[model samples]
Target: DFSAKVIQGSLDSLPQEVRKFVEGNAQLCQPEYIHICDGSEEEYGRLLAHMQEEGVIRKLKKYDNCWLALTDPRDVARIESKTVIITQEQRDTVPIPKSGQSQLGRWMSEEDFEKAFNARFPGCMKGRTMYVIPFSMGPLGSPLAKIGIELTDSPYVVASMRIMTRMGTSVLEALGDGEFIKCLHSVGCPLPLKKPLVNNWACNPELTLIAHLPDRREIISFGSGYGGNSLLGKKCFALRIASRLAKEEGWLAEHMLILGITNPEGKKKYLAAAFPSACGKTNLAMMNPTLPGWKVECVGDDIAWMKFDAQGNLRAINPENGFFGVAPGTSVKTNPNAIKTIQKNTIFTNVAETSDGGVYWEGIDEPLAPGVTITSWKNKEWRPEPCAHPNSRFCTPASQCPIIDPAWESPEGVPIEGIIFGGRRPAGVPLVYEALSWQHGVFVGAAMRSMRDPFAMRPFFGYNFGKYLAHWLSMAHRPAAKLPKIFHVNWFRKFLWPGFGENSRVLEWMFGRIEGEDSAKLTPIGYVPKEDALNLKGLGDVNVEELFGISKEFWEKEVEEIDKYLEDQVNADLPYEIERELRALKQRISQM
Candidate 1:
């Protein structure tokens, strides 16, 4: 139940005009009180009705309980133009700080953002319902979790958040009297009109505003019902905002996955790994190890919140209650578990719809049936021209996963034994190499290069990942247990090397190294698997030297590029220790 004081306090923080708009809209939506969802079927039914009424979603008659949503053609993907950061400094401990703000506008100050936001917010809720969503990021009662209140006009967003987070009355009860992150979102439309008639939804890409106040623990999003734009609790608060919060509070908020690996001996070693999107992050999280005696258990697929416990061991939680995963490239071969999870009770977006109400994406279940007509994501008849939207997604509850870890909601999160950083690279990067030290590992992460340069060569999301490493190094001075060993891996190496399905073999060696059962040969690059150390039993005639060996001439040029990248591209305020590690690595590689 929202007290008058609570409601008034939130309104008082907003501009006067925006406050009035919210107050008036709230009255139109209710019983003068917002509904706190309870994760029930009836609540879903109500939301489904609202979505149908607003033309946001369509129910599938063939499936037992499934729905399909079509995003605005203009908003099929995240609009970087509409995204902005309202921060005082350009280098505020966030990754790609200068570039991120440059790509997304940098609001000069809080007042500047408030002025712009207030103007756009006032009439935006006209003829729409204002729903207050009170949610928590991690487990409701966990100390590591944080509370957030999102007042949104889009029921589509509320539905998504219900699956993404622990929403409703239970979350509110857990957040009793506690400070929370304030979030405001609107679809940026005043009234119903033809699609093109709406300036904010049609031609004005700049109409959308994503403002984040890290210092104040607040988020304000207007325009665009896209997940990246409206779902403030996902990337906005979890990684972008919570990263800063974690730094100040001595924890880490990262775009990583948590998995527990159990060896043939039944020894469990948990790992937290980070990788750019479409680089097998979820596949690895829910991996079915092909190698005998090895097993993988899914703990989390995206966004890991990690902290060092009293014993100094790093522990992590999934933070999200569901998997918001890319639909393409997910098949029985790539990820059967993902296929199984989305079979029912899932929201399919921007993918091709089968004649029988089943969903069909590009890579799922292979070979399209002959003479079958499919409905494309753009609401047109399906064609041979890549029927599914590249960024199509499915939102399903995490509990539906067959491999979900039993300890997913544990307050004391799973203990991590190793941290792995990987990206898509055709060559230059090795099969896998262990860092000599934590600082060395941090440098490796900072210096990581991606072959598929979508945004730029510099730090994007996964780039400058060394920031997490830098934080880990800061904790080294304390008298606590040693940090997890770091390793750099590449699955998209040259075709000559065994890639993809053979990845589990690499994991075998990694777990073995952690337990001191496998030996690694010292190399200037780091520690490479000793000849014949990895289990390549099923893999036919693997070239161990060519796969694990470092090319000095190639690396000599790489070192020069690394030096320039550190000096010119990286932020000056970054940890000095990482810079020193870069220098040391260059010297070591040059000598070799």
Candidate 2:
């Protein structure tokens, strides 16, 4: 019943990926991209308001071809240059697969029994029955491409499969670890298990596990969430491969380790870290010392298949994906060494532009700076043109990483050392390394989940909202015994002023201390640059150690506020109600 007018020709077509989103949000209006400025929340609100004021926003039950009339002169001006919009129909219908038939037995037709084996696996059988397809976005709301996937049964029933490009192919290979077979064993099936067999892949939303045979031929894909069509090209491809390969045999590493040397200092350290996506794991490992006698090297990024060896100690092997690090700030500052490792030609996504017709790095170079871009053509009048900056190419995995490094499997690998678990905390300080038990480690790791869900969460990333939270809680609880020593740190604590709000000094001082610099001890956590720091208000800097080393009294004053409030309800009479309340509280914390 909802309505909005589309630019004359805008309703003529719809990208396959965007169709689902557009069709679902009934009360949508097409604002002129040029007049609407950027696609921020405020712009969206304004657009919606105008559509309502025009008497076009009404509840509609059926989805059919229709358009609402535009009334306001300003609305006309704002939308005149935009594409036509088709009024959305409100209807409840289940999504059905559009690809009529699926190909079976493409890889090995005779070996089809593997699919049955996977279907019987406890973990594999638990997922909802739906097909996942991958597609890419291009110019003019057109789907640039779609990767082929098929379902088969004989050579092995392929229910869901993802095709990838050269770069995506490699990153998937890196995330494999034959963990899916364990599910079959749990189901009490008595099959003579072969070592290194690749049979299944399953992910419980947040984590993906793959199973394989020793020869590495057969595999399954498992994941908590489906990979929707809208994922950025490289990420879509990488996830597909990671899900499928992890279950294959020979995918898990027997021993894995990373050694980094801070260039000038020649200082080196070995760290044993589990592969997690986008947690500064790669950046910390890639850090090169500006001081004397330091060095650094990438052990493994993304997926490191690990298993206990004869000595009962865990050993790790590198997975296929090369390291992916942010290129913005790191391109010249901080870690110049990584610049040489960039893939010769790659695509970088969403690098911000400056007013002077210059480009700036958003995340890696210096944190995000608010800015805008002006172009000769605006909105529908715009045409597809070549990307302007050299660094924009770095976002593509195929063209950005050290693609084929034989040193990844070197015999003289670094030994496993202690573990450090942390992220950019509030600017109280830049870094803090404290000793904690395994439970504490798991708690800290789980606490680091994104507080706010982004647009990508629907349909693919985390549609099963309840289950997703449950899986996270389970991982937080179950991994306590498996985690290594833990530490907590922050780089964005306390606020001071604009421009230089992030506690940059805290990070420099903390990293300096970790590198064994004697002068680091004298740096105050709250210390700020008198020039840039004072200009910006609401920023505070706290020393790293002092924050972590606070006494029980301090904890009561600072940390206990929330914990004590929760404790107030611990003895509530209704147990189920209490549990539900706790779950909601946990979800809020996790989102934080």
Candidate 3:
């Protein structure tokens, strides 16, 4: 029986509700045994051994704690369409504003979730091992930190959680009948009812549901074992569920990357910047600046939770303990801290695997060593299309990052100085521009039609954009608080700027402006850096006019598109202030 591996007498000591929840789910799934995790190194080693025996993971021969796994191609990323919020309000993924209640859309009722669970769960865990993982999203005692208990049949998930979160005994200890997010996941191949099912990556993508009940504070993920899908704490709880909680509690849970930047004289400023995937989020977080005497330190790479301290400062925390980052385009040149971070303790997923047990992805700039043969993510011989899956990933602890701040774990969180929004714009955007006010920054954030959802929170925000937009404005209107200045930036402007590490020059201008350096020239859009204000030290002559040039014609068309999107797509639910911000910009563009 799987009971042989189960740690004896663990359940009786846990909170009654925690035990009851597991007991209740176990009656449905029918696993052979249950193992409660302690989140210790010994337990991690034990888990690695079990996963290796189960053929679920392989410890890479090249690095000490590095491992590799190639999952079902169809289940390589998060399944947003199948992922749902169980609510009586709507079903089949409707937009929140459609309800006229100002809630985010896409959900299932509790009844629907129960029906689905009952039909498939009985056979889902037959002859399998169920693992209970207790975790915390931030530091143990931090007010910003939250507790969650995740149950999964995938040992890979438990191990990944060990890296992605602060988990095990202490987390459970801190939650002595206190509130915690409940998350349940199953690989869903589920012993095939009796045939002793064997597949390298066990999943049922066809009937998958990464379901969340924000109102209930619970998550139930089924049929997939990929990171964002199965790792409930990452996107599911961290952003989606946490966002709803944030709005209710009067804070911000965002898709921004948090970082602390220090100049030559040692003064520091913290910034939180948001960008959609593949737009250099990780590189920017762990930036190795080309501009001498300036240094950047990562606080968190993916999600940030911002709360106002009693002192009225907006403090931000990264939330997760690890970096679940995109693998391709990560090299020594782009994000050196990332390169160093992943050298030893890391998990490479869906990346090209080498014959001698090393891994590589498309953007890896290093040459292969003497005897290694490159095998694609599909385990086939190499070719452009056959190389690493475009969405290959690396999961490593944030503590491994070389530039992580000393106070990264501060329970109070780091005070934010500025917030920036950006995305890959091949054209029609400039290097950077400061918003006239917090409301304009909210407008700038919402104006990006480039994403599937605004602020890259489409798949993550708990409720509708209408209220989410209103929340940002509400925070700004709050009295007795100092709101961080907001800025809009574009690194992929299709022309002059060399982005990577060289973007530090732009930060210099931003912080200087914050320090009252008077470095901006008012443009039709907002404020662009003055020509000579940027420290263009070693970088060759940059076309200042073209770099910061405003195309009246381009903006004239953009302003119309922005209005069409907000007024038409978002409907009347579009916040009035956003409409005001757009009309003001429209007026400015007309004069231009």
Candidate 4:
């Protein structure tokens, strides 16, 4: 029998409802230890000390409060194939048909989810410890922030959660018997005997399940231990569950980054942008502007929550306290801001380690420090020249970001003047373009495709996007419709304009257009930069035609592809406005 000392927090101190919920999970999982995180500095230290002593993490020599982690090579990324959403079988309530479950998820009947959950999760947690982390999404007690409790077996999850959210005893007090999302997770490899682990990170790849119960507002992440899948708060609650909740509550949760741009004249504008993976959301959020006297500041890099303020202005608040960003290709040249942000108090995962106990990734530096011996992320002889995984990550506090906007934590949020959407189409799209209206913006987001991951929320959206698109359309009916203008851009339009800091030139042009400047040429596609619109002060031999020209032949082919995606892939229950937008696009392209 487990000793009474296992409970870290006094059950008497908890609200009766919260106590019961925790007790129920304890009974289900039967963990040998139970720790209720206080979210205090002391509690954080204790967890870190434990993780270090247990050999789950290696402390780095060159940074303060930073450490390196090597997860199971087989368990590096989210297992999208095993991911599921358990909703009712009744189609009357849920819109997605059983046949049309895309790569996003498959419908698992409640019976099977419960059966397997009960049979497997507890067995995995036996002889292990369970840490209960009470977390709030944004700032503590902010109306924009939502509350959740994640019961996880991985200490990495707890430490990462501490950095990513405002978590602890205060969050539970804020809950005060109120509704909260229930998150349950476990790293399925068990400890049969008390002995040193040969490999610190362990997971069951075949049995991993990252599941969400929409109606129940509950989440179950099992077996595999990776970002998003294990953290439960980052992608799971921040976007997936929040998207469903936002739709029901008449608000918006999006996979977008929020940034504030200040012109040389001292005027400020805030914008939110949605770009699929590898499209530079983080780099944009932390931009070091190259344009003379232009300043860029970040609010949130990963997720934004938007709702109408009393004045009918659409306002947004970033619901995350930290950034879980990609590590490789992050250096002084690429993103000096991100590089400085992660210098201390960050967790580096699946990146190369140095002989002197330092950390390095693919783009940390072109020529490494002299005489430094690099260890591969795989913990073996390097095979793929770049030792770090392509998707390797760094978990660092957003507060640490050099340019983090002052309004990021505000309860009232920032009034969004514009929203930008982009995808990685090399040839068809313009370097920058404006949407004709709110309806066109919705179509743009729905039809968005990167080199992959549409909206980047395909894996994160909790419900049938037919309704999600309809929800975006419904926003037009609100009094705040005119507040946020929509635009689109393609920095990856072969980067005719150098990206990174130089991308701020595009922002200056977009802001000028927002401020009623006559810099745009009205095209059939929308507004494109005029011949000398972009301030190409230092760039040489720039071809304006190549960047902004919309090829009719290429666009016609692109329209056909969008048709196949929207009509066939999204299937029935497609919104009427989407079809209308498609017709309008086809007509405009034909005229061009």
lDDT of each: 0.72, 0.28, 0.83, 0.82
- Considering summed lDDT, which 10 consecutive residues are worst modelled in model 1? 454-463
Q: Write the per-residue lDDT of candidate 1 for residues 243-297, one digit (tens) a residue.
A: 7687678887877889988888898988988876563688789888888888888
Ranking of models by lDDT: 3, 4, 1, 2
Worst 10 residues of 3 by lDDT: 91-100
Model 2 spans with C-alpha error above 4 angstroms: 1-269, 272-279, 300-303, 323-331, 350-406, 410-415, 427-430, 449-484, 492-554, 557-592
**Candidate 2, overall lDDT?**
0.28
TM-score for every candidate vs. truth? 0.89, 0.39, 0.95, 0.95
With a 3 Å backbone cut-off (N, CA, C), the pairs that clash in candidate 4 are none
Highest-scoring model, lDDT: 3
lDDT of 3 by residue, 1-592 (tens): 2334465336678898888878877777888789898888888887888878878777889778888888877888986678777766652223434324322346777888899877667758877888999999999979999899998998889888999999989888898989999999998876544333334888887778888888889888998899988999999999989988888899999998999999999999999998876636887888888887998999998999999988889999878999999898888666678989998778888888888878888778888877778888777788446588887889898898888988789999999989988877777788899999889989988886453347867667687677788888998767789988888888877668888888999999989988888889998888998868888888888777777878889999888987866765467557899999999999998987
Instruction: Give lDDT tens digits, candidate 4, residues 420-530.
Output: 887777777878898887888788777788633556677777887778888888888887455577888787786676777878988998899889999888887788878
